[PDB]
Amino acid sequence: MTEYKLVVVGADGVGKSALTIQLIQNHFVDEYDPTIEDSYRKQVVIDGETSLLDILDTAGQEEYSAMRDQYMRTGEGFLLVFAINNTKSFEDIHHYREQIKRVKDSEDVPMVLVGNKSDLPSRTVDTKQAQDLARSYGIPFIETSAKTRQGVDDAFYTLVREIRKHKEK
Ligand SMILES: C#Cc1c(F)ccc2cccc(-c3ncc4c(N5C[C@H]6CC[C@@H](C5)N6)nc(OCC56CCCN5CCC6)nc4c3F)c12
Numbered sequence: 001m002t003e004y005k006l007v008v009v010g011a012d013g014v015g016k017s018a019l020t021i022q023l024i025q026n027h028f029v030d031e032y033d034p035t036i037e038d039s040y041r042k043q044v045v046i047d048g049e050t051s052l053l054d055i056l057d058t059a060g061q062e063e064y065s066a067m068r069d070q071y072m073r074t075g076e077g078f079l080l081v082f083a084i085n086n087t088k089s090f091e092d093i094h095h096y097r098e099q100i101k102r103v104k105d106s107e108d109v110p111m112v113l114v115g116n117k118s119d120l121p122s123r124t125v126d127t128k129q130a131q132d133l134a135r136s137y138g139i140p141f142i143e144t145s146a147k148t149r150q151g152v153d154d155a156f157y158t159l160v161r162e163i164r165k166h167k168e169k
């Protein structure tokens with residue numbers, strides 16, 4: 001039985017809270033307070049190992065206190081979430097990835113790129129763009145919908161697998 005500190009990051013409105021609540025509660029919450037940063041545990045067996053996932057759903061004002069750096073540094077893996085209907089959210093991925101690298105003092109931090117809202121037709125970010133970005137970062141890319149649950153388990157479980165591989169490097 002292993003505990004993992006997972007962190008869900010990305011722009012406002014991409015679906016970080018909806019993704020987190022899908023994983024923990026198996027339903028789509030269409031109104032989660034956009035300002036509230038909170039954490040939740042999900043206990044699940046992944047490839048045979050009981051796993052305690054402690055998931056930080058980030059939110060709130062953009063601030064860079066030394067305390068926030070130290071706290072983010074304890075994250076073991078990060079979901080880099082953008083929404084496929086929001087180009088700005090995709091462009092902001094670089095910032096979140098660099099802040100993770102900045103506080104972890106490492107070029108090899110477990111991360112997964114997540115293209116959320118894949119149920120919507122109003123796509124402005126191409127799947128190929130996202131694949132090219134994830135390839136350039138050396139990380140997996142997973143398409144999700146918090147609305148339908150498409151890809152949600154895959155995104156979190158792939159992140160756990162990336163942490164396990166990191167531990168063995
Ligand atoms: C997350 C995280 C985070 C890490 F993953 C790792 C280490 C970190 C260390 C220190 C701090 C953070 C961190 N905390 C909050 C951030 C944030 N807010 C404001 C909005 C957007 C998401 C949510 C929180 N509510 N916003 C932006 O950036 C928004 C934009 C993008 C370009 C700069 N900035 C200008 C306006 C748009 N960055 C953030 C940020 F880095 C860390």
Ligand SMILES: Nc1nc2c(ncn2[C@@H]2O[C@H](COP(=O)(O)OP(=O)(O)O)[C@@H](O)[C@H]2O)c(=O)[nH]1
Binds near residue numbers: 011030033120145
């Ligand atoms: N259609 C669709 N809407 C979504 C999805 N994920 C989130 N939303 C909606 O997008 C809005 C922002 O989601 P939220 O989880 O609050 O994003 P956060 O700011 O990143 O926590 C809400 O109206 C959600 O219901 C999704 O996968 N599909």
Ligand SMILES: [Mg+2]
Binds near residue numbers: 036059
């Ligand atoms: Mg939220």
